[PDB]
Amino acid sequence: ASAPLGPFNATLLEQLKNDYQKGEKEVTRYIELQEKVAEKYIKMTPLSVTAKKKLPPSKDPRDYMTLSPYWWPDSTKIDGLPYIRKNGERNPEVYEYPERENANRFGDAAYCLGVLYYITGKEVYAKACANHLRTWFTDPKLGMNPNMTYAQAVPGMKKMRGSGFIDSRRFSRALGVAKLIEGSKSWTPSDKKKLDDWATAFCYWMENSTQGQRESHAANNHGLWYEAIHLMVLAYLDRTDRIREVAEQSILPKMGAQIADDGSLPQELKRTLSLHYSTFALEALMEANQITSQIGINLWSTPASNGKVASQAVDYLYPFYLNPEDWKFKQIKPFDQSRAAILLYEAGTALGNQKYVDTAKRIGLKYSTSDVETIPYLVLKK
Amino acid sequence: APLGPFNATLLEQLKNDYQKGEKEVTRYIELQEKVAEKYIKMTPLSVTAKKKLPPSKDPRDYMTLSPYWWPDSTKIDGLPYIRKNGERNPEVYEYPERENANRFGDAAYCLGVLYYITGKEVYAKACANHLRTWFTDPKLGMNPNMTYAQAVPGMKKMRGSGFIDSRRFSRALGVAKLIEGSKSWTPSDKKKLDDWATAFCYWMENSTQGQRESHAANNHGLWYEAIHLMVLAYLDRTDRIREVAEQSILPKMGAQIADDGSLPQELKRTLSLHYSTFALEALMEANQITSQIGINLWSTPASNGKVASQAVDYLYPFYLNPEDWKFKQIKPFDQSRAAILLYEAGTALGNQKYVDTAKRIGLKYSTSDVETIPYLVLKK
């Protein structure tokens, strides 16, 4: 039977579960290594957005807040309130908001535990996953409010900012993995109802707040990630009707706007990590397609109304994934080729492009990596 | 009549008598229609009218300033506001939703009730225009929270006591059900307002402020639950209405009524007869909803034997003769609130003395108070 609908390559996860259940040696050894890695997540104390001591403007510790990193107090002003941007200089104030890193740590823990529950069926993983989900999302004292109002805030700024919504992606992947523990003993009907209610409220905020509306209309990388996150929330809520609408009406029009006829991504080439950022834009499409393809929509091969296919953007980048030294644009730090391997595998498999798939495997991923996002990709670790 | 925040018995009787051409009622409704003309012409209001921004910088967040709190001039930004008991901070007037939520609520209530009585599409059409603008419009509608109601700038702890401000617009939320099936209120209009109400209900039930108000053992707690029932009734959650009545409203009321029927928390106030009445008005409006599904909050005892009728019984002689009231009441008490309350409780209890006194006190037949539209029985 098919995996539950969620934010992962369901084809590979199903293969892992099936092969594990039948005791195939290479898969069993691999999953045993994943269980060894997971043990720190069984031990880990569940995190909460309420850890910060600094209060958001709402004075509510349950509101997620991070500081937009290049913004600083204006000493020309007394309370310094209208913060000013200092290009290239990261403000150390960002460390007053531990959710900047704690949401990633929660997200990794729940993703790993939920995926291992699906593969192994061992109740200990659903029990630990559930503990993390309840504390981060639904606990009446520790759970976060279902909004991203203060994500990458600029204190004192009069116009609200929508660009911090991209911080939602790691906890929203964990939200989606909660579907894998449905039916476990540890995840009760009452647990599910609370998380369904939270996700419904978060979806309302995403769709109807002014910040969410802005992000829903941004024809750029922020808008594409907004829709990938949107799809994760909708998939968790089983709103496959809405997933098809978003895919047809919002994702394909946005992707084209970032691409050129040469297939480059103009908005990302100007950045100082332009190969990383080109990959990051296409990873939004990649994660969107993981969900849409489970219900029958292949985003990699679907032409936009003007013909563009996002495959053209991968085609543009392929020679530089093969030979990153030939990249002429600013990449002031070394490019992480492992993200390229996953992207080529996903696109290559969706397009039936065997050259992309072979290259993904030749680049490969480290077999012993502890990156939870790579757990499905034994196919790249051999 | 559909489930909603009104005396459904009286509204049905008015619609029936209007349809049968009873002369007293048709003349009364004609006067109400004359009153309503200003609401037909009125420009719909929005919470985004303020120029001052809330801490969120979102004009769609409702915000009012707690009246007795002032900038601390000793402090640099003045931020930790200090209380100056008795002296109202004129900064309150920077937040026009303080009055505008009431004006919206009266407009939508009046127009929706008239559509129900008469069936004239013009009333549904205007009512819908006010509802869309206040609640669901993507630029003008209010966010479904009360985070900044009666805020105290700079205070570290969150305040829940401003939630009571929700009661005027929440009655309008409930009247939206009366214009369902009109031509002007589309299936898409209803879906958007359902989603708004679901999100507001989630905020009321799960936010830290809403949880606190849900546990307040005072008249803020009673008004929270009355508001809660308006939202739940609009969402058709009849099972939650029963749970709220049994597990929240009745214990709270039972905790506030003394052996002699008085409300000791209100007796200490400077407007103690007003606040005694205001606490029972919460029970009154809750009962309008719970009685439509068969729960009589006036006669059902709490687990400790206390019953809301005891508290009416205690106040009855002072409603009859307000000058006999011995506790502090520094402004004249509005006897018309007692008329509606005595009629509501007297009808629910079958107490003819209460009902008769309610009619003897009465309400002015020509009043333009939209809340009194159902009470022609009191205006003879």
What is the DSSP track for A55-78?
PPTT--TTS-EEE-TTEE--TTSS
CA distance A289 to A311: 12
> What tokens does A33 get?
């290594």
Residue corresponding to tokens 């009859």 = B320
Q: A143 near A136, Cβ under 8 Å?
A: yes
Of B144, B196, B208, nearest to A60 by CB-CB distance is B208
A228 Ramachandran zone, left/alpha/beta (phi>0; psi -120 to 50) = alpha
Is residue B194 classed as helix, strand or coil in its secondary structure? Answer: helix
Tokens of A52: 């910060």
Distance CA A226, CA A205 (A): 12
Search chain A and give the residue with CA nearest B52: A158
Rounded Cα gap, residues A194 and B235, in angstroms: 18
Mutation for B interface: A59, A78, A159, most B CBs within 10 A: A59
Is the CB of residue B135 less than 8 Å from the CB of residue B53?
A: no
For A135-290, list the strands marked E by DSSP.
Answer: 150-153
B124 min Cα distance to partner chain A (Å) = 25
d(CA B330, CA B348): 31
Q: Is beta strand B63-65 parallel, antiparallel or unpaired with respect to B148-151?
A: parallel
CA atoms within 13 A on the CB side of B162: 19
- Per DSSP, B301 falls in state P
The DSSP H or E segment spanning A72 is strand A71-72
- For residue A212 the two structure tokens come to 């969410």
Closest CA to B340 of B299, B266, B273, B281: B281
Structure tokens belonging to residue A140: 């009446």
Question: Which amino acid type is present at position A121?
Answer: G
Interface test with A, best of B208, B212, B215 (most A CBs within 10 A): B208
| Closest CB from B139, B202, B211 relative to A140 | B211
Cα(A316)–Cα(B185) distance, integer angstroms: 51
Backbone angles phi, psi at B246, to 5 degrees: -75, -40
The answer to whether B146 touches B44, Cβ cutoff 8 Å, is no
Q: Which residues of A touch B143 (CB under 8 A)?
A: 209
Handedness of CA B147, B153, B154, B160 (dihedral sign): negative
Question: Distance between CA A209 and CA B145 in Å, rounded?
Answer: 12
Residues of B in contact with A81 (CB under 8 A): 77
Please name each of the domains of chain A with its CATH number: 1-238 (1.50.10.100), 247-382 (1.50.10.100)
State which amino acid sits at residue B263. Answer: L
- A-chain residue closest to B79, CA distance: A79
What is the separation of C-alpha A33 from the centre of its chain, rounded to a whole number of angstroms?
24
Nearest to B158 among A59, A149, A204 (CB): A59
- With CA atoms as reference, report the closest residue to A137 among A145, A147, A125, A126: A145
How many angstroms separate the CA atoms of A74 and A71, rounded? Answer: 9
Listed residue (A216, A240, A231) closest to A285, CA to CA: A231
Do B342 and B312 meet the contact criterion of CB atoms below 8 Å apart? yes
Nearest to A128 by CA among A187, A192, A172: A187
Which CB contacts under 8 angstroms, 24+ apart, belong to A92-97? Answer: A93/A67, A94/A66, A94/A67, A94/A69, A96/A52, A96/A53, A96/A54, A96/A67, A97/A52, A97/A54, A97/A65, A97/A66, A97/A67
Q: How far apart are CA A130 and CA A122, in angstroms?
A: 13
CB B298 within 8 A of CB B287: yes
Rounded to whole angstroms, how far apart are CA atoms B263 and B241?
25
Alpha helices in A44-168 (DSSP H): 99-120, 123-133
DSSP assigned state of B80: S
Number of inter-chain CB pairs under 8 A, A vs B = 62
Closest-approach residue (CA) in chain A for B58: A160
Distances in Å between the Cα of B296 and the Cα atoms of A10, B165, B170, B277 are 54, 26, 22, 19
Chain-centroid distance, C-alpha B264: 23
Chain CA centroid to CA A302, Å = 22
Q: Find the CB nearest B57 among A78, A158, A205.
A: A158
Residues 6+ apart with CB under 8 A from A290: A7, A8, A9, A10, A346
Scanning the structure block, which residue is given the tokens 């802005």?
Answer: A214
- Residues B163 and B213 sit within 8 Å (Cβ to Cβ): yes
Residue found under tokens 């309610």: B358
A67-100 in b/e burial notation, b at 16+ Cβ within 10 A?
A: bbebbbbeeeeeeeeebbeeeeeebebbeebbbb
Cβ neighbours of residue A220 closer than 8 Å, sequence gap 6 or more:
A254, A257, A258, A267
For residue B167, which of B94, B236, B105 has the smallest C-alpha distance? B105
Contact A208 B138 (CB under 8 A): yes
